[PDB]
Design a protein around this nucleic acid. Structure first.
Lengths: 74, 93, 74, 105
DNA sequence: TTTTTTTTTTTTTTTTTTTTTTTTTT
DNA sequence: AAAAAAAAAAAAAAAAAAAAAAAAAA
């Protein structure tokens, strides 16, 4: 369960400087996959942080502790 | 506004993905964590977009292709292997 | 005082995938300048972090607090 | 090994640069921070090198030039300005090279 | 006046120079 | 740790070879 192609297309077009810009179908497909990996990494890393500090659930404190390395990795 | 709707769509998909991870690992995510990942994903897209556009433009192309994307994902090696495999698979269609 | 050209040349050649790759003299010069800027930024940003948290010296904790943004900037 | 000594050379230079910042800003750097910066710089060279080689390759050259490097330093605008300045200066140093060599004209 | 030969004028190929980038040695 | 040489590629000039214009015949 992940992102729709049309969704990712709209998200990117919001931010292009040049309105000429388009996205190839294969590129769009790879971006759908990349965004899933990003989200799942954030989630999985947060879970590892929560586990590591012996917390009862994944809370914003843990997420925040995992953000710095996540961002370097992306 | 336009960006608000896009963030909501990202949040929905992020929620889906995190829910799948949660059910797999038998550990819950707080609603705030889901929201923060969605926000981070939205913010990350600005950086991804600008870089992709510079990679394409730097090669004198107006259309961003798979090589630009793979270049973008150069940073962790398990991720790079993951991506290349997927690229060959998409090409098989 | 900064990097020697020969040093930067050796550092880069360690990592080239294609052994065919060489470095032009002007490019090498600019890289020497760029690496200085990188190091000085790390140092200066660490000093600002230490000052900001009122530390007596720039310790690893402050450096680590400055790394995330440094890396995004480079 | 080879890379160990390259790391030591990087650490030495990083130490000198950080010493200059320390003396200038009147705040010390721990030895650990110096070592961390050296480690990061060594690791960062891998990313720099691969990117530079791809940029050169990308434009069908075997020699990485100033344009590839400036492209690499694109990310912060203060940085980009600094680098371009330096390049023109370096070229100006190059003119002196022309002055050195004898000219038939 | 035409069509190849002789002197000057032009052309391309090889060799050598002349620079460019990296590595070695004291 | 710095400086110059060694190694490799690039570039320019000198040599070689043919045709055009001008002269000379049939």
């Amino acid at each position: 369960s992940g992102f729709r192609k049309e969704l990712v297309s709209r998200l990117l077009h919001l931010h292009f400087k040049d309105d000429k810009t388009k996205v190839s179908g294969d590129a769009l497909q790879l971006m759908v996959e990349l965004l899933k990996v990003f989200v799942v990494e954030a989630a999985v890393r947060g879970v590892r942080q929560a586990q590591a500090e012996d917390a009862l659930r994944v809370d914003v404190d843990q997420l925040e502790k995992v953000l710095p390395q996540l961002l370097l990795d992306f | 506004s336009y960006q608000q709707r896009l963030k909501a769509a990202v949040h929905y998909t992020v929620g889906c993905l995190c829910e799948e991870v949660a059910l797999d690992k038998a550990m819950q995510f707080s609603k705030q964590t889901i929201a923060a990942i969605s926000e981070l994903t939205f913010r990350q897209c600005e950086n991804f977009a600008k870089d992709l556009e510079m990679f394409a433009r730097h090669a004198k192309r107006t259309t961003i292709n798979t090589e630009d994307v793979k270049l973008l994902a150069r940073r962790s090696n398990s991720l790079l292997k993951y991506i290349t495999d997927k690229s060959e698979e998409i090409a098989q269609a």
